[PDB]
C-alpha cells in the first residue's frame, strides 16, 4: 500500500529529474551560444574604435 | 520562472521554451559572425586602404545584416 | 527493509531535485544578464555605424 | 557538462560554477552599460557637434572601459 504509493512517487521524481537535466543541457547551449555572440560583438566594437583613431 | 514552476506539464513547457530560444539564439550567432566579418573588412577599408583586404565594404553592407538581426528579434 | 531502501532513495532524489532547481535559477540569471549585455553591445555597434555615415 | 555529471558532489560543484559565473557576468553587464553611455556621447560628438550632449568624449575614454572589461575576462 504505502510502499506502492512511495514507489509511485519515485517514478514521478525520476521523470522530473529527466526533464530538469534535459532543460539544463538546453540552457548550457544558450549560455554558450550567447558567449560566442558577445565575443563577436566585442571584437566588432573594438575594431570600430581602433578605426576611428585613424 | 522555474521557481514558480511545478509539475510535469509546467516543466515540459519550460523545456520547450529553452529549446526554441536556443535555436533562435544559434541563428543569431551565425548572423553575428557575418556582421563581424563584414565589420572587419569595413575597418580594413581605412586602416589598410591599399591592402588586399579593402574590398569596398560600406556601412550599408553592414546595415543589411543589421536588418536581418532585427527580423529575428521581431 | 526494501521500503526503507526505497524511502532512502526518495530523500536522495529530493535533494538532487533541490540542487537542479537552484542551478536552474542561476542559469536563468546568466541568460538574462547576457541578454542585457548583448543589447548594450548591439546598440553600441549600431550607433557607431550611424556615426560613420556622417 | 551536466550530461556527464551525476551525484550530490558533482551537482554542488556545478551549481557553484553557475553562481560564480553569474556574478562575473553581472559585473560585465554593469561595465557594458558604462561603455554604452560613453559610446553614445562619443557619437554625439560628431552627429550632434553643437548639441549639449557633445561633452568631449574621445575613443581613449571608451578604451579605458575596454581595459576593465579585459581584466574580468583574464
UniProtKB/Swiss-Prot annotation, chains A, C:
Tissue expression as described in the entry: Predominantly expressed in brain, including hippocampus, cortex, cerebellum, amygdala and olfactory bulb.
Top-level division of the source organism's lineage: Eukaryota
Compartment annotation: Cytoplasm; Synapse; Presynaptic active zone; Cytoplasm, Cytoskeleton
Subunit structure: Interacts with BSN, ERC1, PPFIA1, PPFIA2, PPFIA3 and PPFIA4. Interacts through its C-terminus with the PDZ domain of RIMS1. Part of a complex consisting of ERC2, RIMS1 and UNC13A.
Function field: Thought to be involved in the organization of the cytomatrix at the nerve terminals active zone (CAZ) which regulates neurotransmitter release. Seems to act together with BSN. May recruit liprin-alpha proteins to the CAZ.
Protein name: ERC protein 2
Gene this chain is encoded by: Erc2
Portion held of the full protein: 261 to 314 of 957
Curated annotation (Swiss-Prot), chains B, D:
Signal peptide start and end residues: none
Domain description: The PH domain mediates the binding to phosphoinositides.
Residues of the full protein shown: 415 to 488 of 1253
Function: Seems to be involved in the assembly of the postsynaptic apparatus. May play a role in acetyl-choline receptor (AChR) aggregation in the postsynaptic membrane.
Domain of life: Eukaryota
Positions where Phosphoserine occurs in the chain: 1, 6, 54
Location in the cell: Cytoplasm; Cytoplasm, Cell cortex; Membrane; Cell projection, Podosome
Assembly notes: Interacts with FLNC. Interacts with AMOTL2; interaction may facilitate PHLDB2 localization to the myotube podosome cortex that surrounds the core. Part of a cortical microtubule stabilization complex (CMSC) composed of KANK1, PPFIA1, PPFIBP1, ERC1/ELKS, PHLDB2/LL5beta, CLASPs, KIF21A and possibly additional interactors; within CMSCs KANK1 and PHLDB2/LL5beta appear to be the core components for targeting of microtubule-binding proteins KIF21A and CLASPs, whereas PPFIA1, PPFIBP1 and ERC1/ELKS serve as scaffolds for protein clustering.
Protein name: Pleckstrin homology-like domain family B member 2
